[PDB]
Design a binder for this molecule. Structure first.
Ligand SMILES: Nc1ncnc2c1ncn2[C@@H]1O[C@@H]2COP(=O)(O)O[C@H]2[C@H]1O
Lengths: 504, 504, 504, 504
């Protein structure tokens, strides 16, 4: 199963991968490139690499949690199981270190050159810290000593603490994979940021708890320390840890001290350090929280902000209360508490998508109308692209009689009434259009039109209409025919239209 | 009164409802849809549902407040009145649970399918938690036991604590109804968010207060606990609660500990937990406050921000101080400390509304002018739509003599003076227009015009004017006539105009 | 001096007033309106009113500071000087109350109707609180009693505390005058908001300090209170106040308790209340600070944000590093770290201002050029309005030979070199223009032009140029002449131009 | 080496300098201006000045750190080394003061007038504070005394504290140079702001630590002070300082008190003051942190915000889930999680840069296409400027057969298939163009085109195409030829094209 291994090493065709590299052909090229170095090089966005990093993360986390505690509260640090654990952990880290040379880096296109690009760049960047972390230094030191004890013991713990420098690597890994996870699952940034901070914060607290206890151990439990004053040196490890952790935590969240304020200088300085660390962390957390909160209601906030401008405008012109109310109502009907700019979004989209959206919007209208179903779909598409959405309140004159008409209408939803001299009352339903005659006749509006209820209309401008009809002269005839009947019903004969019909 | 009940079950025609569903016809359709399931199904936006939720909220709140306290500070938990209270409360919750199957869900259109849509979705979503909360588990356990006591008693309290899981339901309800309340009364989001948080925070504090006391009770008041060290075990319930609450509250708001720092591990851990809960809550509160504050002065802030850009621009070109001052003055006059973009807002509005606004703005002007009152209102409307607002400072040449004039003017407010060679001094008042001759003659400006005080003018561009006058050729004649007299007064005869008049 | 008084009562012609009311004539109208009610009514924006409010504010502040302290720490509350102070203060407040009926309200235009508008609205709005505050209730109570003592004494202090309800009025006044002060001196909003909060916060702290001491006094110094445990009942007033204030302050800023955690319930509850008040206040302060900070660097922040978008764009297209660097350099040269949009700002301004700005920008250019100084200033104005600012980096081909030229140029600043076949090297200085021939000839570019150093140019488009020259055909001749000489120098004869010259 | 000195005094030609002054010629002018005053005046942006300020900053920092400590914890303040240090420090400050008269100020152009502009402005601005700081006042006082001791000693320390007023100058310097450093290295503002605050905060803490100890020293260690209660008067200086610092720091970060709550009034008041200082500082820090955090993820946040609007839009129209998914996919492909507006950025850039960018984008396309490599580069440039980027998803009809075609295409990347009646299957690769025939023929689309995979296309509109081809009629012929072959292959003969070819 070498082929399988090879496949694993190369980048898979994931959704994220596709997004990164565009087409699938492009992905293949990357794979081919990878193939140059055999049974050695690993691509940064590979599946195997992901798995490896996952493996690392758990282990790393454990080490960060467990190691300090082990160093501090357990004096028997040369016992079997512990030793076994340590060596094994070190091995994994060593392996990881080795892998980083095989692993490709990303800066432009990813650096796939094995001996030159990856090795020489990594050796001058992060290799120094990593190497120290990977190797078991304390054990080496012990071996050296082998080939007066208290001092040695004291020294060893500090040396062992070098194994905690793996945190940097962990951080790096998190930063890498989190970016990848944004391009997969569409994560909210703020949430992610807060979670990381929380993880960091807790870790720091833990370290402080360990650290505070540790200094006394290192300093041989002097009587003016906090451990000796409470008389909990001979108490169980767990209790001590808890107390230490509590002490650390208080400083972090700005509560208080331990049993008493620190007496000895060493203790005092440690406390101060913790406070400095803690307070800053807390501040950062607060900031993060604020950011998160702002993000969460950003959609709602924005709308309100936009509306505020409208209010200000009104104030500037000193409009009557009634008028203001009307405007407010209109706004409510139009946007329904949702900020967006159709002009921008539609522009951003491509043609087919736009068509799809438009069709969905006006599907009902299309179904209703007799002209739209029979004619070619291309014509329909042409028509619906040029439409512009409008909302009218009840008691608004949509068209006034005698004016110069720039735009016709299409009733998607609601009921509008027609008013003409000696025409009684005529009411229009959904899937009806009005204002077609003034654009055809090139004259004035034959009669007034006023909305009965709230009317949701799709307007079409004159120029657009003309453009549409230059492409499809057969559809104009139908329109003309429709107009003529309406005119007859009304009682106002348009002569030009009649002439045109005769000609036809 | 079954009809009434049915009506209640169906959605009413509220303002919010109208907003949601658009037209009233649409609302009727929803009602009809609801009617399919008889004496069973309840619509989410129904009036009855609202009332039910209101009923729940009070009760729920009471339970959240009262239950924990009861569990903790009252050992006599099997007494009559308490028992009566508990059972009754449980009944209501059970009823509510039953209702959720009858209640429709909102995701698109609301799911009105009774046996399939509502029941199967809710059973796999929130039913598990709810059911546990509703049932009186402790009593059931007791019954089971009936069909050594201390342990049982200890167990029972924890079981009873399951009744506090109703909080989730409460939260859900709040989230639902708050959305509805945004679409009714136009609430500020930030305020709402803060209030909810406050409610939550207080509740949490209360729980902590209860919780802290509770552990000692559960653990049988060990001598190293905070209750036994203060010697307030046998003190009255209320005092204990207060002290406990105080302790909780301090941790929340980051003040301090109780009488002393916790000695026993159990206490210590509890304290730590509280601190973790408390600190985070505080941070969240701070964030919310920040958000609120930003929202409150957002209208003011924005203006300032906008102005800052202007200042920066000036700095970039390194303008003289005098010039800068002038610009500042202009800005002050123009916007009056109010950020808004007329171009956007007007576009957003529909035609009738625009007309109304324009009319209100220029009502005074219309009243003043002799031409506007006599002519058709359509013409007036056409004119006023195309107008563009402008502000001039005293000592600014509005028109310079001999230039090519692109726009005429209309004095809404202020006083402007005309300057011509051997024309002495002429001053114009509100409701007067100037700059009409260059657009009619299609030549140069006959004389200069300079503002006396601050002038608020409505400009009309040449193209727009032409457009207006192609529709109404009768109004042009009047303009021409007006011009001729003015020309005569001046002493500069325009020949083309004269010719036109002769022709007429 | 009744006339003077009358004048004072009426609104003065301040800058703020002018801004509010527009023209000075308008202000006069307001004064006339005011005149309807004689020796009675006061305008809200009057000078006298301002002075009155100033007088109030100091007094009010003093009362807020002094009264609580007096109530608490001085048992001898019936002494002479104190009595004198109190009565006098009350008198002023009573007078202020009376004034509010005379004072006009602002909602639209300000309500100047004396008996109906001002009196009936204020009587149902804020009169209840105010009246109570104004009257000396404690003294009245004492009088009543006159026409067992300890209880009475206890009662009286609480009654006196009603005089602290003037805070509301103070707040109102501050809110009023701060708005006015925005329209005078162009204050930063955030700063103002923070200052108010600080004032409020300190006041609250003071009250808490007083309040904490006060309860013990009211409760007769019970031995389980904080005052009796420290044994500072018989200590001097000042020390007590300080300690009390300290205690209050700690709760506000989240430090700690007093000497010990509160023992008695009353004390405990008070402490809790203070904490609730304090913590919230602190949160608010933090929010305000955040807001202020964001405001302060908003000009800088915005620029950075804008740039970030550019960077993102570059990243999207995956541009070479060199190219990116070039772009960065260009950006630096163009905007100089200053965000602004000329297109918007210029549109916002009126014509004369624009002209002034343009002239200032291109004054140097005008001075340099021989054509601009001799010709009419109108022509110059026309030219300079249509110009568009551009920046070029050294080594950029401004014009390439043989291309179709849409725009000519004007060198404001920097040095550009001309490159033609067998033309050697020609270098242009400030106040020189190039690219004029392609627009005149209506053909192709005669020769290439490349920048030597960083060149700051003003471009003029073809259409604009044509527009300019239709108005002024005499200036075209000069241009033609200039071109011809250049052509001769080059060695490339343009025939059309020659023909035109011949015709001329 | 006087020439060198002179050079140093004058402004160097740095990058920052260039940015400030534009061209290098301009810089020379500044130098010339500087030359008017000889061996005296120093320019604000000079290199020497920078160095001087750097020198000051270290020294100033040291003084701020060291002086207070010296004043407080060392009673032997008249010893040799200390004296030597003090005098030397004073000398430097005196020199700096002298320099400020020689140093030019910046307000517009920098004030280079030596006796009038720089001296008279600085003498009325900041000279008062500075002078006091510079002079050794304590020593002068001592001298005066020379030409009962305890009181004198007490006095002297306070006088010496005047030397701490150099902080203002330091602040000023920082504010100056930080602005300069923004215009050099493109620093993130937020980071800079936070760092300054941190520096300030620490300094304040230090001062508080010193200050707290100092009052006892001044007050002669009264037994009710915090130093005497802990019995650490005779302890070493360092320990005392640490304890004092700790005490200060706790108040700053809101932890607690020292050993006990303050007993004496003096101590108490000091503590309160510290708390006031501390809390405010902490709040400010929090605000700064928040600002920083918002800045850091602003690029990411913005994108998310933008997307939210899209989501809202979708919600408003109530689109199907499938459709929504499609839209999401499109968005992901198009922008790749990166907010930017090409329309704005490109407008902001100049022509050459745009050309460069466009060329880089379409270099591959150019390489691919046979027509583009052979023809003139000018033509290519013309073509590529007018192109518009578009993205298509697999299964989208790019062109539908029979429609009126407004735009042709260019396949940068991906694979698109052509569909015609009885044409089998034809597939196009990168560097191929389609949609050219409808623009040439001025008719309808000959056949449909649908994307196979994700297609990245560059569209060219009809009008733009026409514009391009009016300039280059030779390139049209090639296009026609290409079309004809394609038509032949298809089987649909276009007659007009054929006619044109014949004519040619
Ligand atoms: N000898 C010259 N001196 C100054 N400018 C020139 C000379 N020759 C050409 N130019 C300018 O360089 C430009 C090149 O393109 P145009 O033909 O648009 O217009 C040309 C002139 O404006």
């Amino acid at each position: 199963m070498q082929r399988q291994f090879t496949s694993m090493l190369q980048p898979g065709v994931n959704k994220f991968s596709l997004r990164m590299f565009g087409s699938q052909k492009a992905v293949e090229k990357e794979q081919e490139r990878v193939k140059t170095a055999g049974f050695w090089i690993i691509h940064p966005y590979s599946d195997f690499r992901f798995y490896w990093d996952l493996i690392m993360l758990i282990m790393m986390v454990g080490n960060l949690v467990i190691i300090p505690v082990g160093i501090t509260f357990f004096t028997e640090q040369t016992t079997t199981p512990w030793i076994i654990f340590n060596v094994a952990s070190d091995t994994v880290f060593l392996l990881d270190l080795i892998m980083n040379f095989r692993t490709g880096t990303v800066n432009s296109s990813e650096i796939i050159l094995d001996p030159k690009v990856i090795k020489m760049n990594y050796l001058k960047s992060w290799f120094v810290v990593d190497f120290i972390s990977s190797i078991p230094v304390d054990y080496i030191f012990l071996i050296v000593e082998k080939g007066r004890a208290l001092r040695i013991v004291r020294f060893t713990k500090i040396l062992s603490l070098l194994r905690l420098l793996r945190l940097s690597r962990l951080i790096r890994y998190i930063h890498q994979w989190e970016e990848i996870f944004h391009m997969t699952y569409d994560l909210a940034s703020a949430v992610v940021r807060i979670f990381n901070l929380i993880g960091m914060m807790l870790l720091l607290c833990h370290w402080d708890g360990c650290l505070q206890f540790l200094v006394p151990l290192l300093q041989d439990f002097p009587p003016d320390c906090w451990v000796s004053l409470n008389e909990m040196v001979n108490d169980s490890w767990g209790k001590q840890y808890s107390y230490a952790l509590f002490k650390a935590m208080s400083h972090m969240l700005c509560i208080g001290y331990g049993a008493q304020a620190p007496v000895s200088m060493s203790d005092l300085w440690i406390t101060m350090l913790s406070m400095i660390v803690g307070a800053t962390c807390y501040a950062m957390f607060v900031g993060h929280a604020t950011a998160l909160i702002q993000s969460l209601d950003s959609s709602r906030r924005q709308y309100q902000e936009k509306y505020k401008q409208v209010e200000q405008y009104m104030s500037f012109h000193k409009l009557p209360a009634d008028m203001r109310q009307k405007i407010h109502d209109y706004y409510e009907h139009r946007y329904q508490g949702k900020i967006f700019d159709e002009e921008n979004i539609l522009n951003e989209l491509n043609d087919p998508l736009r068509e799809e959206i438009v069709n969905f919007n006006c599907r009902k209208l299309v179904a209703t109308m007799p002209l739209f179903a029979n004619a070619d779909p291309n014509f329909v598409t042409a028509m619906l692209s040029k439409l512009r959405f409008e909302v009218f309140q009840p008691g608004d004159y949509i068209i006034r009689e005698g004016a110069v008409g720039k735009k016709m209408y299409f009733i998607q939803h609601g009921v509008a009434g027609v008013i003409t001299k000696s025409s009684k009352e005529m009411k229009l339903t959904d899937g009806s259009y009005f204002g077609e005659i003034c654009l055809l006749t090139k004259g004035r509006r034959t009669a007034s039109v006023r909305a009965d209820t709230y009317c949701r209309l799709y307007s079409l401008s004159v120029d657009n209409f003309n453009e549409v009809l230059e492409e499809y002269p057969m559809m104009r005839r139908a329109f003309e025919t429709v107009a003529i009947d309406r005119l007859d019903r009304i009682g106002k004969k348009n002569s030009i239209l009649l002439q045109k019909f005769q000609k036809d």
